[PDB]
């Protein structure tokens, strides 16, 4: 429904006014929102677009991985007490039983955080160096931000129209996931509980179990 | 109906102690789990749906 | 090397195809690292370069001055009153005030108001002079980042390529000092101990006394 | 805009199409005044200029009754909700200033100020101010002054002004420069004023019947509709149950 | 007098020690002391966005500083009008009081009970207002984005362009002072836990030791 | 007791779900059919 | 017995979903009429 061009929907609806001239609707997720003017020249606009999409994909994975073990623990998967919730799941590798995937001590059973971090550093350094270089020993001449090929095994991005629609879907889901991950961070800081527990408390009593209930817990004392 | 029961004399509670009486309902059950558990309850004996 | 198109870059074998067009290896410290595109505009690039250089020199001074009164209290046995840098400023609130090397005959300052007033006056005049680039007769013909007149009294920059390589040395040293100062700040926050104490504990037990040992300090309750 | 609903031959009438054929509307009401619903059942208007004179009377009444409705309903509600106000009930405020009594004026939301003016000073000031203002209105000429819109105006700014809709100094915020918005705001003015006139008559008759002000009436009725209404207060003693 | 705040000989942010004003700060816009040491406003469109945002922040901070100072000044001799809510950073919790938020302590004013309801009303109203400011609405359609001055200038005072320019300078300078004061309010609240007027009177009691250095060891780590 | 029972008759269980695996298999089967229908949607 | 309940729930959900999305699959268009 006109996700590109000068008839695209904008970020204040009919109250949007005229969008900035550099936001012409060429790129996915254009709602005419650069009120700070940070994307005014095209070089940093392109850099901000790749930064936004990388953040969006990372936050999609992060939101799914923040939700999933809490739901599994509430559905009977034996996460003990801290692997259940995301902002304490890191400490499990210091437990003498170790960090076991899905609570199964046969899976992973990791205890050396330094070894885990070193493996992550080397693997992600190779991967992000490849992404920055825009090339790999088997990947040559692809888009830096939408590579495809081996990164599109099932070939969903073959028709250009479907590709543009899926690009809009990806950026909108990723922005929702970034919004929800910011929510996860702030809710963990404020409430001190997992997001699923926050949702369950709110469903238990929405009138009094909300953020305003925690509005007085950070006030500075004389 | 809600306004009648809350402010305008209440409605007849047959479960009022002593044989039932007209009662003002205070704190109606607004819990979504309790409210929507009626509509997904089975209609058979001992459950009766809504 | 550190200049031109064949220069050292910030991702090595991964840098040849994503170096920004505006990073041509003209200025020192150009490893091609601009991923957010903050210095795409030339004027903003110049302002960011000068801000980085001022920060680098301030961080070189700060990294030397954070470690010196704690190394001297560690091995040299010099008494200070408070060797720990993030507790140093409170010395002026003590009974003996702030004595420079520890001995009460050096400074013995007891007025934070007076020392702040003197610092504000001196630093304001100095930074106004640096920003103005002179005072209409007091060196209006010097460079904004590398003045070179009475700021290079020993003349280490006589040869232009020596000057360029010394700029590279200065910017790499300053970036190392900025990284180390951020480390100083974060270590202070997460340990409550000086950097020398942190290094001593780490050398005492590497696999135990490390940052992950403080990974659960700021967990919310 | 959309002025066809209020002006011309296809405007809104006081009866719908199936009850009022448009050969039953009087000829002196043909949709050039605001609020023309074709409503003159008793023929108190006769021709266009009789309608104009009665519209002068209607517009002055409408504005006075809008001010009156606000000033009747607001102080009583403030007093009942806790403002230090005496005589908040609209038909009791006069007796509060009889034997040297004063009034408290609550400037919202800043606070109550005790008004030191006695009844004689109040009535003298009101008589002279209202007499001067109504003389100015009927003459179309004033002693000059300042307005927030057009600035320090001379005494000649009132010349050539419609007496009913002067504007200018009386329009500091404008909002009537466009003729279409001026016409529809005239319609809004006359409808609001007629509603306020009906409301003030309601206030008077309700106050006479129930012995209390309209805020008390609306609050007690909205707190017990079937237990507090006209028929209940006409009943008086509760009722002998039918059973 | 315009030369005092406009043109090349205007007042600058370092007095006589500011001859290297950035070339894009040409003394055209209100304020313009030649202060841009980071080059954030080198791009003209981003400079326009920054000017709009600065003026909006300036007006918000004028209102905010006045609203943060006013109820503490209007406190009585016994704290009966306003309780803890006399202090601005404790004002919001007033809506959780049993009598609700009564304006100026009078229960006939506002008497607001439901924070969710007042927040929803504010979201609707402020969304409509900001949409009008961006796009155009009941109070204007194509006026200036920063100085519409038709419905929002009821009293005149700006028909003369000279008075308009000097009042623009007055507005931006008062707004910058108010922004500085609001940042001071935030930092003072965080580091002291007392109201700004309480801080002022405490300082006036004995300025030698009633100062920020008396709290200089507050956030020290252990 | 002499034998084991699910003990689910009555008690008002939503969709008769006495174990969350039942809700999960309901959601999974419905979602799988929906996903098949949705990928095969501009088709007749 | 719980395994039997899980299997029966899966079977019933499968057939009900087939029914629902079958009538969702443009069913008023599957007729030999003109129009
Ligand atoms: C727009 C700015 C704004 C600011 C700065 C505050 C600040 C505050 N509110 Mg608050 N509110 C604001 C808007 C609104 N509040 C409320 C409704 C409430 C309630 C109901 C309550 C508060 C409370 C509080 C305080 C929480 C205690 C604390 O230490 O918190 C953290 C704050 C500080 C440490 C002080 C320094 C603030 C400074 C860092 C702010 C500057 C950065 C901002 C976050 C700007 C971000 C953008 C905007 C959109 C927020 C706090 C000082 C509570 C209170 O008073 O408890 C005693 C409380 O109960 N607010 C509404 C809806 C009516 C608002 C807007 O619509
Ligand atoms: C003649 C010399 C002169 C000097 C030196 C300055 C200097 C300054 N003017 Mg100024 N002005 C001068 C003349 C004039 N000004 C103005 C009009 C203005 C305006 C209108 C404004 C300024 C502003 C500024 C400031 C902008 C730079 C800045 O923020 O630096 C950074 C400053 C520092 C880094 C100093 C830090 C000192 C340090 C001791 C701080 C304290 C540290 C703590 C004790 C420890 C805490 C550490 C950790 C824990 C946080 C700056 C301090 C602007 C401003 O920011 O105002 C508030 C501004 O808006 N000036 C006029 C009238 C035309 C002048 C006329 O001569
Ligand atoms: C212009 C219309 C107007 C109307 C409809 C009323 C109506 C009323 N006045 Mg009133 N007054 C009016 C104007 C004025 N009154 C007063 C001064 C008083 C007094 C002093 C008293 C009334 C009282 C009354 C009531 C009984 C008569 C009645 C409801 C009496 C009252 O309130 O009885 C309870 C009463 O004692 N009025 C002044 C100032 C001189 C007025 C000026 O315009
Ligand atoms: C020149 C002075 C002059 C004054 C003071 C008034 C005052 C008034 N006229 Mg009036 N008029 C004046 C001239 C004229 N009027 C009219 C035609 C009308 C009409 C048709 C109507 C009015 C109405 C009104 C009243 C409401 C308007 C208003 O803003 O009220 C509040 C008053 C002010 C904001 C200004 C007061 C400031 C200062 C002059 C006096 C300060 C008083 C303090 C006690 C001190 C009000 C009492 C309306 C009315 O009666 O509604 C019920 C109404 O319908 N006038 C004409 C013919 C073109 C005038 C010609 O000179
Ligand atoms: C749901 C029923 C309904 C609907 C949608 C309509 C719709 C219409 N009627 Mg109406 N009509 C109805 C009921 C209805 N009628 C009833 C019950 C009456 C008897 C009082 C009439 C008698 C009537 C006449 C005689 C005329 C119309 C005509 C019209 C047309 C325009 C004028 C108008 O709105 O009526 C105007 C009606 C009123 C002003 C009555 C008051 C309406 C308010 C809104 C009542 C508030 C309703 C509220 C929700 C409470 C409902 C009570 C309920 C619980 C029992 C329009 C097509 C006109 C027409 O066709 O002209 C050619 C015409 O001449 N109507
Ligand atoms: C929004 C309404 C508004 C505002 C705030 C002003 C403001 C002003 N008027 Mg007024 N005035 C206006 C509309 C208004 N008027 C209208 C509608 C009329 C009728 C045409 C007048 C006619 C007028 C005259 C006759 C005089 C003023 C004058 C005054 C000044 C003193 C009045 C005073 O202290 O009494 C308080 C008044 C309040 C509204 C409060 C004041 C600056 C005086 C002036 O300028 O002195 C030369 C004066 O002589 N006014
Ligand atoms: C002291 C600060 C100050 C000053 C100097 C100005 C100056 C300017 N503004 Mg304003 N502005 C201010 C604050 C200020 N503003 C605030 C806080 C807001 C947000 C409410 C605005 C919103 C605003 C808009 C939306 C517009 C302007 C316009 C104007 C111009 C018209 C002249 C004028 O306002 O008279 C100078 C101002 C004063 C003399 C006011 C100072 C004294 C007052 C009486 C204090 C009032 C305090 C009050 C109790 C706080 C509650 C206010 C609340 C009701 C909103 C002028 C350039 C208009 C314009 O450019 O038209 C061409 C325009 O469209 N401004
Ligand atoms: C009128 C219907 C009133 C009840 C509505 C809710 C029904 C309900 O929740 O059932 C829920 C019940 C509950 O199921 C039973 O519940 C008991 C009490 O909790 C026990 O737990 C039993 O173990 C459990 O099987 O499931 C059923 O019995 C059958 C549901 C499947 C019906 C398939 C109909 C297929 C036909 C058309 C589908 C069209 C779409
Ligand atoms: C547009 C615009 C325009 C205008 O004008 C201006 C402005 C305003 C600037 C703008 C805006 C902006 C924004 C909104 C931003 C935001 C962002 C975000 C939020 C991000 C996030 C983002 C986020 C993210 C990434 C996230 C991610 C996450 C993750 C990974 C996670 C992970 C994890 C997990 C799984 C679990 C475990 O247990 C833990 C961990 C390990 C932790
Ligand atoms: C390149 C890039 C690319 C794209 O753009 C993207 C991005 C990412 C953005 C980028 C990056 C950036 C960065 C890295 C930044 C950083 C910075 C820093 C760290 C600084 C510091 C900095 C730091 C510093 C100065 C510091 C300094 C220090 C000092 C002075 C000290 C002082 C002292 C002393 C002596 C001692 C005592 O007792 C205390 C005190 C008093 C305290
Ligand atoms: C120029 C330049 C250039 C170079 O080169 C670079 C740089 C450095 C970047 C620069 C600078 C900048 C700056 C200075 C900034 C700052 C700003 C601010 C401070 C703002 C505030 C701002 C501020 C603001 C808005 C504020 C506002 C406030 C408010 C609303 C308040 C409210 C309130 C009130 C009433 C009361 C209650 O009870 C509470 C509350 C609710 C709380």
For chain D, what are the domain ranges? 48-235
In which residue are the tokens 């100026």 written? E104
Question: How many angstroms is it from D89 CA to the middle of ligand 4?
Answer: 27
For residue D136 and ligand 6, the question of a CB distance below 6 A is answered with: no
Please list, residue by residue across E19-36, b when 16 or more beta carbons sit within 10 angstroms of its beta carbon and e when fewer do: eebeeebebebbbbbbeb
Tokens of C24: 């041509």
Gap between the Cα atoms of A156 and A151, Å rounded: 11
Pairing of strands B21-23, D145-146: unpaired
Mutate to test the pocket of ligand 4, among D57, D62, D122, D136 (most ligand atoms within 8 A of CB): D136
Task: Report DSSP state, residue D112.
Answer: E
Question: How many angstroms is it from E63 CA to the middle of ligand 11?
Answer: 11
E138 in contact with D, Cβ within 8 Å: no
Cβ A84 vs Cβ A69: under 8 Å: yes
Question: How many angstroms is it from A123 CA to the middle of ligand 11?
Answer: 43
Gap between the Cα atoms of A197 and A201, Å rounded: 6
For residue E91 and ligand 1, the question of a CB distance below 6 A is answered with: yes
Gap between the Cα atoms of E194 and E89, Å rounded: 9
Mutate to test the pocket of ligand 4, among D55, D137, D152 (most ligand atoms within 8 A of CB): D137
Tokens of G18: 């087939």
Q: How far is F17 from chain A (nearest CA, A)?
A: 13
Q: How many domains does chain C have?
A: 1
Q: How far is CA C148 from the centre of its chain?
A: 20
Gap between the Cα atoms of C200 and C187, Å rounded: 13
Tokens of A54: 């990388």
The domain of F32 spans 1-44
Task: Report DSSP state, residue C214.
Answer: G
Gap between the Cα atoms of C221 and A192, Å rounded: 5
Tokens of A13: 């609806």
Minimum Cα–Cα distance from A204: chain B residue: B31
Q: How many of the other CB atoms lie within 10 Å of CB of A205?
A: 12
Q: Is C134 exposed, middle or buried (0-12, 13-18, 19+ CB in 10 A)?
A: middle
**Beta strand extents in chain D (DSSP E only):** 103-107, 111-115, 145-146, 152-153
Tokens of D75: 């102080």
Mutate to test the pocket of ligand 3, among D89, D94, D128 (most ligand atoms within 8 A of CB): D94
Nearest CA to ligand 2 atom 65: E15
Cβ E113 vs Cβ E95: under 8 Å: yes
Gap between the Cα atoms of C110 and C94, Å rounded: 8
Q: How many of the other CB atoms lie within 10 Å of CB of E106?
A: 21
**Which long-range contacts link D185-188 to residues 24+ away (Cβ below 8 Å)?**
D186/D34, D187/D6, D187/D34, D187/D35
Residue among C219, C191, C208, C202 nearest A112 (CA) = C208
Cβ A196 vs Cβ A87: under 8 Å: no
Tokens of D243: 């059973």
Residues in F touching G21 (Cβ below 8 Å): 33-34, 37
Gap between the Cα atoms of D168 and C93, Å rounded: 69
Chain C touches chain A, with at least 3 Cβ pairs below 8 Å, answer: yes
Please list, residue by residue across D105-128, b when 16 or more beta carbons sit within 10 angstroms of its beta carbon and e when fewer do: ebeeeebbeeeeeebeeeeeeeee
Q: How many residues does chain F have?
A: 44
Gap between the Cα atoms of C171 and C27, Å rounded: 10
Chain G touches chain F, with at least 3 Cβ pairs below 8 Å, answer: yes
| Secondary structure class of D103 (helix, strand, coil) | strand
Residue among D76, D65, D73, D91 nearest D198 (CA) = D65
Cβ D17 vs Cβ D24: under 8 Å: no
Q: How many of the other CB atoms lie within 10 Å of CB of D104?
A: 18
The dihedral built from the CA positions of residue G24, G26, G27 and G28, taken in this order, carries a sign that is positive
The DSSP line for D61-76 is: HHHHHHHHHHHHHHHH
Q: Is C151 exposed, middle or buried (0-12, 13-18, 19+ CB in 10 A)?
A: exposed
Gap between the Cα atoms of D20 and E48, Å rounded: 61
For residue D152, list its beta bridge partners. Answer: D146
Nearest CA to ligand 8 atom 34: G16
Q: Is E50 exposed, middle or buried (0-12, 13-18, 19+ CB in 10 A)?
A: middle
For residue B22, list its beta bridge partners. Answer: B12
Q: How many domains does chain F have?
A: 1
Gap between the Cα atoms of C166 and C156, Å rounded: 9
Gap between the Cα atoms of A195 and A67, Å rounded: 8
Q: How many domains does chain A have?
A: 1
Task: Report DSSP state, residue C98.
Answer: B
Tokens of B28: 């109606």
CA distance from start to end of chain B: 18
Residue among C17, B24, E116 nearest A131 (CA) = C17
Superfamily designation of domain D48-235: Chlorophyll a/b binding protein domain (1.10.3460.10)
Gap between the Cα atoms of F17 and A97, Å rounded: 34
Pairing of strands B11-13, D145-146: unpaired
* HEC profile of G1-34: CHHHHHHHHHHHHHHHHHHHHHHHCCHHHCCCCC
Which ligand neighbours the alpha carbon of E175 most closely?
7
Domain range E2-215, CATH architecture: Orthogonal Bundle (1.10)
Cβ C63 vs Cβ C184: under 8 Å: yes
For residue E33 and ligand 11, the question of a CB distance below 6 A is answered with: no
Gap between the Cα atoms of C179 and C59, Å rounded: 9
CA torsion, ordered C79, C80, C84, C87, to nearest 10 deg? 150
Gap between the Cα atoms of C157 and C141, Å rounded: 17
Cα angle: E105, vertex E107, E113; to 5 degrees: 100
| Secondary structure class of C100 (helix, strand, coil) | coil
State which approach was used to obtain the coordinates.
cryo-EM
Q: How many of the other CB atoms lie within 10 Å of CB of F15?
A: 13
Query: Max Cα separation, chain A?
Result: 64
Q: How many of the other CB atoms lie within 10 Å of CB of D12?
A: 14
CATH number at residue C74: 1.10.3460.10
For residue E186 and ligand 1, the question of a CB distance below 6 A is answered with: yes
Which ligand neighbours the alpha carbon of C60 most closely?
10
Gap between the Cα atoms of D215 and D76, Å rounded: 6
Pairing of strands E110-112, E101-102: antiparallel
The counts of H helices and E strands in chain C are 4, 0
Residues in F touching B50 (Cβ below 8 Å): none
Residue among E51, E55, E30, E12 nearest E178 (CA) = E55
Residues in B touching A205 (Cβ below 8 Å): 31
Task: Report DSSP state, residue D206.
Answer: H
Residue among D118, D40, D106, D45 nearest D77 (CA) = D106
Please list, residue by residue across A113-122, b when 16 or more beta carbons sit within 10 angstroms of its beta carbon and e when fewer do: beeeeeeeee
The dihedral built from the CA positions of residue E90, E92, E96 and E99, taken in this order, carries a sign that is positive
Those residues with Cβ within 8 angstroms of residue D103's Cβ, 6 or more apart along the chain or in another chain: D86, D87, D93, D96, D97, D115
Q: How many residues does chain D have?
A: 243
Q: Up-side HSE of residue C55: CA atoms within 13 Å toward CB? A: 15
The DSSP line for chain E is: -GGGTSSTTS--TTGGG-----TT--S-SSS-----SS-TT-SHHHHHHHHHHHHHHHHHHHHHHHHHHHHHHT--SSS-SSSGGGSGGGSGGGGGSTT-EEGGG-TTSEEE--HHHHHHHHHHHHHHHHHHHHH-BTTBSSS-SS---SSS-TT-S-SSHHHHHHHHHHHHHHHHHHHHHHHHHHHHHHHH-S-HHHHHHHHHH-TTTSSGGGGTTSS---
Q: How many of the other CB atoms lie within 10 Å of CB of D152?
A: 8
From residue C141, give the alpha-carbon distance in Å to each of C126, C131, G28.
17, 13, 86
Q: Is A151 exposed, middle or buried (0-12, 13-18, 19+ CB in 10 A)?
A: exposed
Answer whether the bond into residue D109 is a cis peptide, omega within 30°: yes
| Secondary structure class of A43 (helix, strand, coil) | helix
Gap between the Cα atoms of A9 and A28, Å rounded: 12
**Which residues between 5 and 44 in chain F have a beta carbon less than 8 angstroms from any beta carbon of chain B?**
9-16
Q: How far is CA D99 from the centre of its chain?
A: 31
Flag whether C114 is in a domain.
yes
Residue among C36, C15, C63, C54 nearest C171 (CA) = C54
Task: Report DSSP state, residue D13.
Answer: -
CA distance from start to end of chain F: 57
CA torsion, ordered E168, E172, E177, E178, to nearest 10 deg? 100
The dihedral built from the CA positions of residue B24, B30, B31 and B32, taken in this order, carries a sign that is positive
Gap between the Cα atoms of D85 and D78, Å rounded: 8
Q: How far is CA F32 from the centre of its chain?
A: 12
Residue among E53, E52, E112, E62 nearest E85 (CA) = E112
Residue among D108, D99, D51, D34 nearest D75 (CA) = D108
Gap between the Cα atoms of G24 and G31, Å rounded: 15
Please list, residue by residue across A153-169, b when 16 or more beta carbons sit within 10 angstroms of its beta carbon and e when fewer do: eeeebeeeeebeeebbe
Host H or E run for residue B12: strand B11-13
**Beta strand extents in chain A (DSSP E only):** none
Cβ C84 vs Cβ C194: under 8 Å: yes
For residue E166 and ligand 11, the question of a CB distance below 6 A is answered with: no
In which residue are the tokens 């403080």 written? C214
Task: Report DSSP state, residue A60.
Answer: H
Residues in E touching A212 (Cβ below 8 Å): 115-116
Question: How many angstroms is it from D189 CA to the middle of ligand 4?
Answer: 17
The domain of C68 spans 12-214
The DSSP line for C118-178 is: HHHHHHHHHHHHHHHTSSSSSS-SS-SS---SSSSTT-TT-SHHHHHHHHHHHHHHHHHHH
- Ligand 10 atom with the smallest distance to the CA of C182 is 19
Those residues with Cβ within 8 angstroms of residue E184's Cβ, 6 or more apart along the chain or in another chain: E196
Those residues with Cβ within 8 angstroms of residue C48's Cβ, 6 or more apart along the chain or in another chain: C38, C39, E38, E39
Q: How many of the other CB atoms lie within 10 Å of CB of C5?
A: 8
Q: Which of B38, B42, B45 sits opposite F16 (nearest CB)?
A: B42
Tokens of C38: 């903050």
Q: Which residues does a 6 A CB cutoff place in the pocket of ligand 10?
A: C 33-36, 38, 55, 58-59, 62, 65-66, 85, 88, 178, 181-182
For residue B11, list its beta bridge partners. Answer: B23
């Amino acid at each position: 429904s006109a996700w590109y061009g000068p008839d695209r929907p904008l970020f204040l609806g009919s109250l949007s006014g005229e969008p900035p001239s550099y936001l012409t609707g060429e790129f996915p997720g254009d709602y005419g929102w650069d009120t700070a003017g940070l994307s005014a020249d095209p070089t940093t606009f392109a850099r901000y677009r790749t930064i936004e999409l990388i953040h969006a994909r990372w936050a999609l994975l992060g939101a799914l991985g923040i939700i999933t073990p809490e739901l599994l623990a509430k559905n009977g998967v034996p996460f003990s007490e801290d692997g259940a919730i995301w902002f304490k799941a890191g400490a499990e590798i210091f437990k003498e039983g170790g960090l076991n995937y899905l609570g199964n001590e046969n899976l992973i059973h990791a205890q050396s955080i330094l070894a885990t971090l070193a493996v992550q550093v080397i693997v992600m350094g190779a991967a992000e160096g490849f992404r920055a270089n825009g090339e790999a020993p088997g990947v040559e001449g692809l888009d830096p931000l939408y590579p495809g090929g081996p990164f599109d095994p099932l070939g969903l991005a073959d028709d250009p129209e479907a590709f543009a629609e899926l690009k809009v879907k990806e950026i909108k889901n990723g922005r929702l996931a970034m919004f929800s991950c910011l929510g996860f961070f702030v809710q963990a800081i404020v409430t001190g509980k997992g997001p699923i527990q926050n949702l369950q408390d709110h469903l238990a009593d929405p009138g009094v179990n909300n953020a305003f209930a925690s509005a007085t817990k950070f006030v500075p004392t004389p | 109906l809600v306004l009648k029961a809350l402010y305008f004399g209440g409605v007849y509670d047959t479960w009022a102690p002593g044989g039932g009486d007209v009662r003002i309902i205070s704190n109606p059950t607004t819990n979504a789990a309790i409210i929507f558990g009626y509509i997904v309850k089975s209609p058979f004996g001992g459950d009766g749906w809504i | 090397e550190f200049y031109g198109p064949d220069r050292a870059k910030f991702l090595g074998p991964f840098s040849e195809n994503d170096t920004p067009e505006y990073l041509t290896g003209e200025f020192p410290g150009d490893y091609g690292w601009d991923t957010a595109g903050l210095s795409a505009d030339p004027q903003t690039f110049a302002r960011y370069r000068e801000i980085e250089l001022i920060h680098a020199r301030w961080a070189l001074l700060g990294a030397l001055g954070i470690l010196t009164p704690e190394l001297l209290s560690q091995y040299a046995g010099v008494q200070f009153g408070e060797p720990v840098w993030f507790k140093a400023g409170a010395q002026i609130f003590a009974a003996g005030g702030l004595n420079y090397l520890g001995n009460e005959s050096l400074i013995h300052a007891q007025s934070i108001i007076a020392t702040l007033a003197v610092q504000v006056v001196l630093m304001g005049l100095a930074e106004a002079y640096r920003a103005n680039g002179g005072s209409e007769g007091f060196l209006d013909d010097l460079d904004t980042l590398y003045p070179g007149g009475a700021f290079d009294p020993l003349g280490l920059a006589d040869d232009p390529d020596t000057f360029a390589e010394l700029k590279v040395k200065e910017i790499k040293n300053g970036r190392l000092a900025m990284f180390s100062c951020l480390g100083f700040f974060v270590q202070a926050i997460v340990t409550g101990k000086g950097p020398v104490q942190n290094l001593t504990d780490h050398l005492a037990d590497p696999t135990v006394n490390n940052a992950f040992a403080s990974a659960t300090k700021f967990t919310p309750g | 805009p959309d002025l066809e609903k209020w002006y011309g031959p296809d405007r809104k009438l006081f009866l719908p199409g199936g009850l009022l054929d448009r050969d039953d509307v009087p000829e002196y009401l043909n949709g050039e005044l605001a609020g023309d619903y074709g409503y003159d059942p008793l023929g108190l208007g006769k021709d266009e200029e009789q309608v104009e004179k009665y519209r002068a009377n209607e517009l002055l009444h409408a504005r006075w009754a809008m001010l009156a409705a606000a000033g009747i309903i607001i102080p009583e509600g403030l007093q009942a909700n806790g403002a230090d106000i005496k005589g908040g009930t609209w038909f009791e405020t006069g007796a509060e200033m009889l034997n040297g009594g004063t009034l408290n004026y609550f400037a919202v939301p800043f606070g109550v100020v005790q008004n030191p003016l006695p009844l004689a000073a109040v009535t003298l000031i009101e008589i002279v101010l209202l007499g001067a203002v109504e003389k100015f209105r009927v003459d179309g000429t004033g002693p000059a002054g300042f307005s927030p819109g057009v600035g320090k105006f001379d005494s000649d700014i009132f010349d050539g002004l419609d007496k009913l809709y002067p504007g200018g100094p009386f329009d500091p915020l404008n909002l009537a420069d466009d003729p279409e918005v001026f016409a529809e705001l005239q319609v809004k003015e006359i409808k609001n004023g007629r509603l306020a006139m009906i409301a003030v008559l309601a206030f008077a008759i309700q106050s006479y019947v129930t012995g209390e002000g309209p805020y008390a009436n609306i609050t007690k009725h909205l707190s017990d509709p079937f237990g507090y209404n006209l028929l209940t207060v006409l009943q008086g003693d509760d009722r002998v149950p039918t059973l | 007098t315009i030369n005092q705040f406009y043109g090349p000989d205007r007042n600058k942010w370092l007095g006589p020690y500011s001859t290297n004003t950035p070339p894009y700060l040409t003394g055209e816009f209100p304020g313009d002391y030649g202060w841009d040491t980071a080059g954030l406003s080198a791009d003209p469109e981003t400079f326009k966005r920054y000017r709009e945002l600065e003026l909006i922040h300036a007006r918000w901070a004028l209102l905010g500083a006045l609203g943060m100072v006013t109820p503490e000044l209007l406190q009585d001799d016994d704290g009966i009008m306003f309780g803890e809510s006399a202090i601005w950073f404790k004002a919001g919790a007033a809506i959780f009081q049993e009598g609700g938020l009564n304006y100026l302590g009078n229960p006939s004013l506002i008497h607001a009970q439901n924070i969710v309801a007042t927040l929803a009303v504010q979201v609707v109203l402020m969304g409509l207002v900001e949409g009008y400011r961006v796009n155009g609405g009941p109070a204007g359609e194509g006026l200036d984005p920063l100085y519409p001055g038709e419905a929002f200038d009821p009293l005149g005072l700006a028909d003369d362009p000279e008075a308009f320019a000097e009042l623009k300078v007055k507005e931006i300078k008062n707004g910058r002072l108010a922004m500085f004061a609001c940042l001071g309010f935030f930092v003072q609240a965080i580091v002291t836990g007392k109201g700004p007027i309480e801080n002022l009177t405490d300082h006036l009691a004995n300025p030698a030791e009633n100062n920020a250095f008396a709290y200089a060891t507050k956030f020290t780590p252990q | 007791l002499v034998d084991d029972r699910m003990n689910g008759d009555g008690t008002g269980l939503p969709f008769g779900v006495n174990d969350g695996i039942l809700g999960w298999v309901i959601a999974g089967t419905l979602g799988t059919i929906w996903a098949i229908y949705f990928v095969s949607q501009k088709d007749l | 017995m719980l395994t039997l309940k899980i299997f029966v729930y899966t079977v019933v959900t499968f057939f009900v979903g087939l029914f629902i999305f079958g009538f969702l699959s443009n069913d008023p268009s599957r007729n030999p009429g003109k129009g």
